[PDB]
Ligand binder design. Structure first.
Ligand SMILES: Nc1ncnc2c1ncn2[C@@H]1O[C@H](COP(=O)(O)OP(=O)(O)OP(O)(O)=S)[C@@H](O)[C@H]1O
Lengths: 549, 295, 152, 443
DNA sequence: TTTTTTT
């Protein structure tokens, strides 16, 4: 088909004047940002192409091969009319997008093992006819074959990688066995997946020529399974004051109340800062959440909300049913390796063995676990651990203490920062509100798309610091809290937690400076939380928590 | 542009005082605008990070044409000047400006009332290291000061951003007034010259202009020795648009207020623009400064 | 020492010390052939060399001969045809002599006829011989020029 | 005899170019050899030439003609091995940096070394290598493994003058206890024992069939929250060679290695005590550890003699290590409220085979508590404790200085006790053994 | 035909 010559003029009538939601040429506004970042990639939604001119959708399923070769070069010249000197960067931008041959296919799967990255010839130049032959094209997975021979020099290369992909164990019909298929990577997509993931790729489907037919999928657009005005309109809203209670009010509308423990969980995933001193040492960068449950609670529903909204979350089972959080060479990183700079979800400590005790022990303290294995490396782990426990026998035994109530030991609790505890007592109106909001559940807060851009945009950018004039009250708080709780029995790590929790409130305002309000909220959340763990004789502690305010 | 020959063009603009306010480098808006200038230059980010010595010859020869073809977009058209460059041959050429900045940086680093006088003695002690530094052949010591100049400019622009977030400026009609009562790395602020260039770095930043009515800035800091709070005078900088013989104001005002009760005031500073004052007494000093305003 | 043995302390006679370990198998090798022709009623003579025996780079002369000149049957003979045994062993240096902390590294030395099966794996042996390097070092058709030691 | 010298100087964009870089050494190879100058011979006509070569990384090979014509063809050339010249070759392999971008498994490359660069660095250092990122082909899809040829490796008299100056000051012991843990207040007895561990005692080569042991051992059993963890990390950073281990269970760190496989050969890979022969071993979680190869550790610190009698090898090797412990008793601070033993469930013979045993307590002192509070707030914020630069101007100018000093200190002095001091220790061991008699026989 | 696991 030679008509694509004339179609190249008209395919830019879609590129730079795609008027949707009052004009807004997302492609034309995007190109200046593409060459701005030198990403050498342009994204094309199948919705927009199907919406404007579906003749190209036919040109996708029938001939996806040469259509890209015609589309990317015109995108190159269409970008160079915008940037006069962009050809000095890369000068080539590749684009993104039996009944299966010669078509683009939306494919799912799980990443099996793979290989390294090698360069591959792109330009082929060739003693028979005097001098060299001339430039020729390096076919993909095929030779040129124009006596002469290819020389070592004068060869422009291209990085290559092939990726094995096998079927996803999640949508397997139950009991059958998975099968395999080949995926080959190209330039900007070099080594994008990682073992232990799922993936959704947009591939063109080919087959081998002859052997002396195996099919190979070359892939175009990798998307993982689930702009300028987008962050500035975002900043027009983020300037307000009452976002504190609103975050908890926008955190989890399924169960309506419980603002305190919901604010603590919302603070946990929002992160802390380890703040490595220049040359000296790094302290700790995570917030530790324990939530002592009760049968008869939808506390698990909360952590499921945590897993869908947050970045990397692998649900760690109750007892050995899964992944195992400790990487080990078996016939290879653990799930904690997947959750780097993310939040892990580990629960039901009552039924977890010592393997988990060592992994969780070292990971929340100083991030790295070593062995008595024939390889010696130090892989760290910056996970964030959120637990959900269960009381022994009764949900709450008596006035007897928390350490007497729980079956764990003291140092594992020491690794923990916050202790949110729920209570079960017969309230008539709470049951009324509960049943009525349940009815509403079967029928002002931030929409979930804005909050996900909020936490992702915040954790990559907001970097809290602190001044030296406001921590003296805090020093007095630690001094009275430790020195007065001597008669009670205490955590020095909770001293570091003060700054590491309070820094998140400055992360909430994206102000980079810790106001007094942040310290006051951090004190009013930590102190009373420690208060709630005692006996009925806590009245005295209630009568000394005034000076605390 | 500053620190041209010994540093990356990226850091050169990043720490550039002239480029600072126009591009609003402290804020995130101009960040992309800076990369946009490089996108006009067609320079890879990694190419900008390399040392000036190892950058390609093409990039060298074409630098000025590229500047002529790109920077004008941001109003930078009047920059290129025919300034002199020394040829010492084999160790490489340097514009007089850069060597000046390095030597003055060598002046400020690279080193009851008895401690303050002891420190004053140490300032004079650092002068001979500079007088010795004036020779061409003694390069060993010179490179240390050359690099420490970068360490200063880093701290300057950093604390500068910190001041930009709190907006402690009192935009008054008479004159702008500010004070830094607390902050990290206050030891470097002991030298008056630190605050001289610091004030200059602010003065051009807050007002480009940015019409109208350029106003003087007030600045002070203290750590020990009972609220020394050196306050040095500062004057507005015009962006080429000596239009008038304005010069200064403060000498007469200092004579008027120092002629009053003047308790604990010390005129010990050789330069008339800077004076030591107690904060307790600096507040009324300000009150008397506002009114009667001599200007 | 084997640690500083390569490149220099090369193509000379080297005194090596170390431990006898992993003794290989005993195979005999043919050198001088005796062949009888039926009609002439005479004997004959033919030799063959390899890189272990000559110590000098000579043209190798390998196929077992029959029907050379006229058509006389070259019946080979035995007994009078000579043979020499052959063996190769590895000697790593003494482990206490090693650097700060490492796995000791080693080379090998080839013996000859009257010295076959004199070292069992596991003894203390001083060795005097000549450092011989054989083989086409990758110029045959990727790191070659494998080594051994002779004249022992 | 004078060969040609070698000069030593110091992705799609990186193929075969002048690039400097930096990484960590994964594993080296055994000193190998390519050839440099060589003469060939025609086996029939006796025709000889000679070729010198430099770039041993394909370009040219032996011809197949007698060359006297310029039919003996094909290739008649036989390499004269008695009149050749050779050099050495190393073949390192490097591993990525553990602080940045492992967001994965560690990746690696292949190195190759030339003439005077051989046998230079034992693995474990953090180094920089200037290189050439070139491509080779060996083991229709054009799969080629890339590599970096090494040119100019750089490592990790007047100093003797300042060393002698620092040796004779009588305040050296304290100024070193102002050098180890600036981030940690208190714990000064531990802070002192680290000073003695980084130097190492005497080493006796007696007519006796054994030699004795020199380096020492550090224990930190005690209550949690002490940050003894930060202390053991900084111990690893100070010594030039040392192995830090956090517990019995890793992601990737092993401990006599048994490797069985290409060419069907058994070979010895390594481990952890092997890297730390003559260094510091840090073991965290002394009670969270298994009894699977613990015996090697029950011997490595006492007789320095690891035996291997497996399927591959039958050697007795050396291990000059020093182990540093950091335990936790059961139930935290209550272990001292019952009988004062009740800590190691197996027995006390391992502790008898250690050197120093310290117990960390936790007593409230409000001034100490406020001081440890604001001391740590000053550590986090406002860089108050971080004043150190004037302290550098007055005490302990650097950590790397301390390292260079220990390197100079270990092999130079030959310490030994003094005869007038020996009778003091002889009279003192009596008092300690009597002390144990008092606490034991009457109880 | 031998090295890391787990019921
Ligand atoms: N002066 C300090 N004292 C105690 N902890 C500190 C101090 N400064 C910072 N820290 C931090 O507080 C944490 C307290 O835990 P550790 O002191 O490691 O307790 P632990 O006794 O090591 O528990 P382990 O490691 O399982 S034995 C440290 O890991 C540091 O992150």
């Amino acid at each position: 088909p030679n008509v694509s010559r004339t179609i190249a003029r008209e395919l830019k009538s879609f590129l730079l004047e795609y008027t949707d939601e009052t004009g807004r040429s997302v492609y034309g506004a995007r190109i200046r940002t593409l060459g701005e970042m030198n990403s050498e990639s342009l994204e094309v939604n199948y919705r927009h192409l199907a919406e404007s001119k579906a003749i190209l959708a036919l040109f996708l399923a029938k001939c996806p091969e040469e259509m890209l070769k015609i589309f990317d070069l015109v995108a190159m010249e269409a970008t160079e009319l915008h940037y006069p000197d962009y050809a000095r960067i890369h000068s080539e931008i590749h684009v993104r997008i039996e009944s299966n041959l010669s078509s683009l296919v939306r494919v799912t799967g799980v990443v099996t093992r793979r290989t390294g990255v090698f360069p591959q010839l792109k330009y082929v130049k060739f003693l028979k006819c005097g001098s060299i032959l001339g430039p020729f094209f390096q076919d993909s997975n095929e030779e040129i074959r124009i006596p002469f021979r290819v020389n070592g020099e004068k060869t422009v290369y291209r990085n290559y990688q092939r990726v094995t992909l096998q079927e996803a164990p999640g949508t397997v019909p139950p009991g059958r066995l998975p099968r395999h298929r080949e995926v080959i990577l190209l330039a900007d997509l070099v080594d994008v997946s990682k073992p232990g993931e799922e993936v959704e790729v947009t591939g063109i489907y080919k087959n081998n020529y002859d052997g002396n037919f195996a099919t190979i999928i070359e892939a175009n657009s990798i998307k993982r399974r689930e702009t300028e005005e987008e962050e500035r309109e975002f900043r027009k809203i983020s300037r307000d004051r009452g976002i504190i209670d609103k975050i908890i009010s926008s955190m989890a509308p399924s169960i309506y109340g419980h603002r305190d423990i919901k604010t603590a969980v919302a603070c946990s995933l929002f992160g802390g800062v380890p703040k490595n001193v220049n040359g000296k040492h790094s302290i700790r960068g995570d917030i530790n959440v324990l939530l002592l449950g009760d049968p008869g609670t939808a506390k698990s529903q909360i952590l499921k909300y945590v897993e869908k909204t947050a970045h990397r979350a692998v649900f760690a089972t109750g007892q050995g049913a899964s992944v195992g959080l400790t990487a080990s060479v078996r016939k290879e990183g653990g799930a904690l390796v997947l959750a780097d700079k993310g939040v892990c979800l580990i629960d039901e400590f009552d039924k977890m063995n010592d393997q988990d005790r060592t992994s969780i022990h070292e990971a929340m303290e100083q991030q790295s676990i070593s062995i008595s294995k024939g390889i010696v490396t130090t892989l760290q782990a910056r996970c964030s651990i959120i637990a959900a426990a269960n009381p022994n026998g009764g949900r709450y035994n008596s006035t007897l203490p928390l350490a007497q109530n729980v079956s764990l030991t003291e140092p594992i609790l020491s690794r923990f920062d916050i202790l949110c505890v729920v209570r079960d007592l017969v309230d008539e109106e709470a049951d009324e509100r509960l049943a009525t909001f349940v009815v509403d559940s079967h029928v002002s807060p931030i929409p979930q798309e804005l909050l996900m851009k909020y936490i992702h945009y915040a954790r990559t950018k907001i970097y809290p610091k602190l001044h030296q004039m406001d921590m003296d009250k805090v020093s007095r708080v630690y001094a009275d809290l430790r020195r007065e709780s001597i008669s009670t029995g205490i955590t020095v790590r909770h001293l570091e937690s003060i700054l590491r929790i309070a820094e998140s409130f400055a992360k909430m305002r994206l102000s980079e400076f810790v106001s007094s309000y942040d310290l006051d909220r951090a004190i009013k959340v930590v102190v009373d939380s420690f208060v709630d763990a005692q006996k009925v004789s806590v009245r005295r502690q209630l009568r000394r928590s005034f000076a605390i305010y | 542009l500053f620190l041209l020959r010994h540093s990356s063009l990226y850091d050169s603009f990043y720490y550039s005082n002239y480029v600072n306010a126009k591009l609003s480098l402290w804020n995130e808006n101009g960040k992309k605008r800076l990369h946009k200038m490089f996108a006009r230059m067609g320079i890879p980010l990694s190419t900008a990070q390399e040392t000036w010595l190892y950058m390609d010859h093409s990039i060298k020869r074409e630098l000025g044409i590229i500047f002529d073809k790109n920077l004008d977009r941001y109003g930078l058209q009047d920059i290129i000047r025919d300034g002199f460059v020394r040829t010492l041959g084999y160790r490489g050429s340097i514009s007089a400006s850069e060597f000046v900045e390095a030597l003055t940086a060598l002046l400020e680093v690279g080193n009851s009332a008895q401690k303050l006088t002891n420190l004053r003695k140490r300032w004079v002690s650092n002068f001979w290291l500079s007088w010795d530094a004036l020779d061409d052949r003694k390069v060993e010591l010179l490179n240390r000061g050359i690099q420490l100049a970068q360490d200063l400019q880093r701290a300057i622009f950093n604390t500068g951003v910190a001041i930009l977030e709190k907006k402690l400026i009192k935009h008054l009609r008479i004159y702008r007034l500010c004070v830094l009562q607390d902050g990290p790395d206050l030891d470097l602020y002991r030298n008056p010259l630190t605050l001289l260039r610091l004030g200059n770095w602010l003065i051009e930043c807050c007002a480009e202009s940015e019409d109208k009515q350029l106003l003087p800035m007030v600045l002070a800091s203290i750590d020990e020795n009972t609220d020394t709070y050196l306050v040095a005078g500062l004057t507005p900088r015009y962006p080429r648009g000596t239009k008038k013989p304005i010069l200064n104001n403060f000498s007469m005002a200092f004579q008027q207020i120092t002629a009053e009760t003047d308790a604990k005031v010390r005129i010990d500073n050789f330069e008339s623009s800077i004076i030591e004052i107690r904060r307790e007494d600096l507040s009324p000093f300000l009150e008397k400064l506002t009114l009667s305003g001599l200007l | 020492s084997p640690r500083t043995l390569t490149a220099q302390h090369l193509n000379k006679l080297v005194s090596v010390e170390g431990i006898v370990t992993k003794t290989s198998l005993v195979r005999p090798k043919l050198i001088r052939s005796v062949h009888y022709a039926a009609k002439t009623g005479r004997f004959h003579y033919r030799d063959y060399t390899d890189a272990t025996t000559t110590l000098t780079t000579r043209i190798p002369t390998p196929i077992y001969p029959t029907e050379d000149t006229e058509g006389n049957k070259l019946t080979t003979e035995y007994g009078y045809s000579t043979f020499i045994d052959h063996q190769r062993i590895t000697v790593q240096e003494m482990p206490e002599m090693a650097p700060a902390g490492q796995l000791p590294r080693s080379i090998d030395v080839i013996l000859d006829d009257d010295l076959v099966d004199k070292t069992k794996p596991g003894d203390r042996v001083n060795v005097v011989g000549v450092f011989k390097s054989l083989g086409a070092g990758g110029m045959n058709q990727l790191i070659g020029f494998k080594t051994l030691i002779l004249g022992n | 005899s004078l060969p040609t010298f070698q000069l030593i100087l110091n992705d799609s964009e990186h193929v075969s170019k002048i690039v400097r870089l930096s990484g960590i050494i994964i594993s080296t190879s055994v000193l190998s050899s390519r050839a440099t100058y060589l003469s060939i011979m025609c086996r029939n006509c006796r025709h000889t030439t000679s070729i010198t070569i430099n770039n041993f990384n394909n370009t040219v090979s032996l011809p197949r003609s007698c060359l006297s014509t310029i039919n003996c063809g094909p290739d008649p050339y036989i390499i004269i091995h008695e009149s050749s010249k050779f050099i050495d070759q190393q073949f390192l392999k490097l591993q990525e940096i553990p602080e940045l971008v492992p967001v994965e498994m560690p990746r690696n490359l292949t190195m190759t070394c030339d003439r005077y660069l051989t046998n230079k660095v034992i693995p474990g250092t953090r180094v920089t290598i200037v290189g050439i990122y070139s491509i080779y082909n060996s083991k229709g899809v054009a799969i080629r493994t890339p590599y970096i040829k090494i040119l100019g490796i750089q490592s990790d008299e007047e100093e003797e003058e300042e060393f002698l100056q620092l040796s004779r000051n009588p305040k050296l012991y304290e100024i070193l206890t102002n050098s180890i843990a600036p981030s940690i207040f208190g714990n000064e007895d531990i802070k002192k024992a680290i000073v003695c561990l980084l130097m190492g005692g005497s080493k006796k080569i007696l007519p006796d069939g054994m030699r004795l042991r020199g380096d020492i051992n550090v224990l930190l059993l005690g209550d949690p929250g002490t940050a003894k963890s930060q202390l053991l990390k900084f111990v690893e950073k100070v010594s030039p060679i040392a192995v830090y281990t956090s517990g019995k269970g890793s992601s990737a760190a092993g401990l006599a290695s048994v490797q069985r496989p290409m060419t069907r050969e058994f070979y010895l890979e390594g481990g952890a005590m092997v890297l730390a022969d003559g260094g510091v071993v840090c073991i965290d979680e002394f009670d969270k550890m298994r009894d699977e190869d613990r015996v090697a550790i029950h011997e490595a610190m006492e007789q320095q003699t690891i035996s291997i009698a497996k399927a591959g090898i039958t050697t007795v090797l050396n291990s000059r290590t020093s182990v540093l412990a950091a335990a936790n008793p059961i139930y935290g601070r209550y272990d001292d409220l019952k009988s004062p033993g009740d800590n190691i469930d197996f027995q006390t013979t391992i502790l008898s085979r250690f050197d120093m045993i310290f117990i960390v307590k936790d007593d409230h002192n409000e001034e100490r508590d406020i001081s440890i509070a604001n001391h740590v707030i000053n550590i986090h914020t406002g860089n108050a404790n971080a004043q150190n630069q004037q302290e550098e101007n007055g005490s302990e100018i650097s950590i790397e200085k301390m390292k260079r000093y220990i390197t100079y200190c270990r092999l130079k002095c030959a310490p030994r006790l003094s005869p007038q001091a020996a009778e003091k220790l002889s009279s003192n061991f009596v008092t300690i053994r009597k002390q144990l008699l008092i606490n034991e026989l009457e109880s």
